Design a protein around this nucleic acid. Structure first.
Lengths: 150, 129, 142
RNA sequence: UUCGAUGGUAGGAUAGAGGCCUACCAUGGUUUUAACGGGUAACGGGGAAUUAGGGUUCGAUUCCGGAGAGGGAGCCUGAGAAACGGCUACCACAUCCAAGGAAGGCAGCAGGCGCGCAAAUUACCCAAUCCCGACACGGGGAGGUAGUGACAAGAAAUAACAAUGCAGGGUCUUGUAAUUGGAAUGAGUACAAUGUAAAUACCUUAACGAGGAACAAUUGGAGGGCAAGUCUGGUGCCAGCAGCCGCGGUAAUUCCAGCUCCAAUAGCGUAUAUUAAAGUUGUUGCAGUUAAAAAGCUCGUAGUUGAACUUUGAGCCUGGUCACCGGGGUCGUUAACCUUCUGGCAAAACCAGGACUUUUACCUUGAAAAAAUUAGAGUGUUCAAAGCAGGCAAGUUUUGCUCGAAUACAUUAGCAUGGAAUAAUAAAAUAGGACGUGUGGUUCUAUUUUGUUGGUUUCUAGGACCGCCGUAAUGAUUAAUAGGGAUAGUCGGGGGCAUUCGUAUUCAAUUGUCAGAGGUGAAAUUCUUGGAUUUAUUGAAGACGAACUACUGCGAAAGCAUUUGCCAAGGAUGUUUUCAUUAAUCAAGAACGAAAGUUAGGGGAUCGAAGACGAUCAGAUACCGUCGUAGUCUUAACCAUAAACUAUGCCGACUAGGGAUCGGGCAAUGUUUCUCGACUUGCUCGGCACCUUACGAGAAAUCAAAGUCUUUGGGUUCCGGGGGGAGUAUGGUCGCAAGGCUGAAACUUAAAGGAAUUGACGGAAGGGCACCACAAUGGAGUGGAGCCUGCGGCUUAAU
RNA sequence: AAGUUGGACAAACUUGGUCAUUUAGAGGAAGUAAAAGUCGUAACAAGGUUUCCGUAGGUGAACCUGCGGAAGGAUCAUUA
RNA sequence: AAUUUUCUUU
């Protein structure tokens, strides 16, 4: 049940039953933690952190060896972005759609998609303000959205 | 989206019983589902059930033996006092001797008859006969 | 379908309140039309004065003369149509006889083949029908 | 919110709080959880009617509270009145006037007028209940009693014992009695006792008081509904009957007269309001593909609903109505009344009592709670509606005893006790944390004493704030075949911009012979030896992307079909990636929204509303042919609906067998073509659909949903309450307009409608039959002529 | 006491705006019901131009036509 | 091509 679509896909990742560090691995916990910190300074999103670590370095799930989620590790070590990754990606997509619309005003489909993205951004922002991830006076303005992204 | 898991469990069980199958797989599982099933088990309508403990809500495989006609849920959870138990029994049960109404009494999930014995009302969960 | 939440009493009550106006019976009670525009303000009977006699024609498949009269109410000023039940009473009933008008028994609807008539006469000259018919009482010399 | 609407200060006024009022200072208070305004033929409640339950309606009225005394306003007296059987002024009425004036209020008890369908005596009494006063002694139209009725409930006059023959029945019993006769007769008549303030009445009193008009039972119906006539006479679609269907045109079981029968009974019918049936208001418990009904589609806030997970189980003691059940304490799993105050024990710690929900919703019990009324316990008003009394006690008459006048229903709402299952929020993140006879400090108070108030330092006891000390296991639920986001290869006739190509249509120029060309069923209009049409070359304009093209793809829908490039975005798939409940459905509010229609600019090839002619027809105004304006294309502004359809809302779970198709992924010591592609097979996810079947559903047609529904409850929006009137009128709102949205009432009607079946019909199809059908150059003919004869019309007397 | 000056409550009257209800009117445009009228035949069969919906135009009228949709069609079908 | 109409009942 897609929130803004009629699709009913169920594609996802099925984590293993064994919630333990890998039997054949030498991650050494702290080495991976500093490795994540190095990649965070390099400037890649936590999704890219897990993808690169799983595909190349060979750690299936980082929390299995580290004991905490990578976002928790980044927050604990201080490299915590002010805007959450999902909200940042949504606002960046909205900015790209708005730029496309302002250069090409006849794209009614893009206008409809911008409305959907705007609604999704507002719902996500309301959730984050309620939980406390963002200041209660966060708000979202299209004029300053470009400065918010950059 | 999913609203109540007991309703889905009872709908699947009654569908399997009507089809005539001797087993049914229920997902998701919960404490309310477990308490409902043990009440049905101590009353003899449902045989052994194995709770598959996953690192999730968890699944359960139930062995049936027929002898039940329909198990259903009562949504919303109406508040049932001691005096309203008879009215609910007349409204839902086939007769005064056959049929069980499950109430989430403050003492715990229990049948309407033993809820009367304990002299405590609650909220109506469902029924089976 | 219908709301079934434990806290949807207001929604259910409001929807029932809106939908109950579609009921013909509820509308006819709550509109006050009996006291607003109906010839009878809830009264069972009303006195009136005979205006004229009209020979209405029966509808299909019947064919006869209904022997009706027109009566002007004294308390409302509304001119209505009246039906004489028996036969040979239109000769007895003359103009200005102080007739009494009542319903027909169809809750204000036309009964039978009579077109556009909803009332019937019960008393003439303050003596009552079926009394002068059997020559038990006589019309006063008015 | 002016002229008090929300709050603060101060004052005034009030018996008293208070914007009740005044001065100043602030702009506040309510509201889609419906504020405010309007209507109410609305005094409110206890309560009444119907009664499976849930509900619906009523409640002026014997009890409680509020208002009024014709409508307002003011005021004295009095504790208590803004009193009206107290006063004053105005407004609308009535009255005596000598014309100067005077004077009132029955929505109190009686009585009168008027409105009326609609409702009583100008009566007696303070004897019972109580009230007032100076008070045994007085008064009370409060109140008790009676006169009047058709009705409000309860009991019951219009009968009945035998002889009698017939129909009988099986020697025992019912009926028609133009029959008798002695019986018990009560309604009344009178009188006596009792009753009562006086009575009336009830009870009670001897006694008079039926042989048939005894001292005449009625009201409706007799076709179905619904019970009881095809009986006799009068009319003949007329009178009429008739709740609906419906009967009546000379045989009328349904009209009016007679006979009899059926139902209730001193009562019955009719008119209206309401309730049950109405599962046609549907929370229980309706229906929405075709009968009325899913917004064209999407976003979105109130509102509603919201995955799972945090202490479960085993063994005892003791006492309770029946191998059983409810209730209190424990020990070990894992520490077992957390924490506080007080009292004790004392190396901190323990026991006892009180408080003990962070915070509710929920359930149980208790308290205080008006009676009547409802249910209901007891009880000889002769039973009963009743009433709350009453009983003992025949053998003494004893100046006595004995009992009851319960209980529940109530709980909406408030208060309190007990439980913590079901449904919620924070328990500490930058540790802002149980941290505590702990290492140090500061602020205040005297709950005590220094002699009594009062002033300071503070030992002392207490409240609070500042950096440190690991007391110890120091703190972040998995990540939902939920969701969002990211990532990789893809996929798409998804969107926009720029660009490329294709034939066809029309037109223009030029070249070749000549007679028709178009079109149609037939034609006809029109133009063609001035070269029509055709053929050939070149060019321009606009429109559109044939075949490929499919029970195939994409998009929220409307819709999207030539090549390439660019941009933004999207579904599915793969994933030991990321966040962690962020979710579903929506009022109000917004985006898109075919075609047609509008305003300005460009362009107008083809087709083509309006129109022009030309054929068909009785009339063609249309269907047919040619031409033809708006329009068909596009840009910038509009609107906003279609059979916008799958006539079928969205999300989630389950349910039977098979084979095709699209996109992705997995596997093949599979095939093939100079590392990949194509093809083949199996598995899986997500779509478009298909065949068979019916565990199941529906009224059926039919449906893998329209199933999991009388065995009725997963969540959430829209929408319908018989057919016309009518998507009309009015009102509001948007639009330049056309029109869009919302949207009645009066009146009328017994049907409208859906599915399916059998006939009939079809200028529908497919098989065939026929000189009462045709074909055959058919044969003979009739009708054309004159006459025989029959039928219409004419005439007469009948023709 | 008669009488006098101010203040507050304040009946009531004239006028203007607003709300609710009721009620005349010259005239105009509708629906509703008919024992046997005039005009023609739109729909129900391929109703004789298949029907219906939205929009626009026209005509004595049912109605006709242009554009886009639906089968509720008279086709569930041409795999070659 | 072309084919309009069948009063109210028994």
């Amino acid at each position: 049940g897609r929130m803004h679509s009629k699709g009913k896909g169920i594609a996802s990742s099925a984590l293993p039953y064994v919630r333990s560090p890998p039997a054949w691995c030498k991650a050494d916990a702290d080495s991976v933690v500093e490795q994540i910190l190095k990649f965070s300074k390099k400037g890649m999103s936590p999704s890219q952190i897990g993808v690169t670590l799983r595909d190349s370095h060979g750690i299936p799930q980082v929390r299995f060896i580290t004991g905490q989620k990578i976002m928790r590790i980044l927050k604990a070590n201080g490299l915590a972005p002010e805007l959450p990754e999902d909200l940042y990606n949504l606002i960046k997509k909205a900015v790209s759609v708005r730029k496309h619309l302002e250069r090409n005003r006849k794209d009614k489909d893009s206008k409809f998609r911008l409305i959907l993205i705007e609604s999704r951004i507002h719902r996500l922002a309301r959730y984050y303000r309620k939980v406390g991830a963002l200041p209660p006076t966060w708000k979202y303005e299209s004029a300053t959205a470009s400065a918010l992204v950059a | 989206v999913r609203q109540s898991v007991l309703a889905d469990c009872l709908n699947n069980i009654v569908n399997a019983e009507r089809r005539g199958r001797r087993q049914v797989l229920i997902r998701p599982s919960s404490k309310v589902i477990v308490k409902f099933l043990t009440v049905m088990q101590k009353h003899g309508y449902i045989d052994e059930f194995t709770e598959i403990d996953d690192h999730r809500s968890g699944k359960i495989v139930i062995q049936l033996n027929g002898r039940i006609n329909k198990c259903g849920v009562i949504s919303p959870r109406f508040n049932v006092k001691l005096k309203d138990i008879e009215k609910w029994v007349n409204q839902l049960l086939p007769s005064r001797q056959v049929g069980v109404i499950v109430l989430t009494t403050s003492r715990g999930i229990m049948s309407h008859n033993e809820a009367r014995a304990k002299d405590a009302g609650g909220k109506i969960l469902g029924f089976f006969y | 379908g219908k709301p079934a939440g434990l806290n949807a009493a207001r929604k259910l009550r409001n929807h029932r309140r809106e939908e109950r106006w579609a009921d013909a019976h509820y509308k006819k009670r709550l509109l006050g039309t009996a006291y607003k525009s109906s010839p009878f303000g809830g009264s069972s009977h009303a006195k009136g004065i005979v205006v004229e006699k009209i020979g209405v024609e029966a509808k299909q498949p019947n064919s006869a003369i209904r022997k009706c009269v027109r009566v002007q109410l004294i308390k409302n000023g509304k001119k209505v149509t009246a039906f004489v039940p028996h036969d040979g009473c239109l000769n007895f009933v003359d103009e200005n006889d102080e007739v009494l008008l009542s319903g027909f028994g169809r809750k204000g609807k036309a009964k039978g083949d009579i077109p556009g008539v909803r009332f019937k006469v019960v008393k003439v000259a303050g003596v009552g029908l079926s009394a002068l018919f059997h020559e038990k009482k006589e019309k006063p010399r008015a």
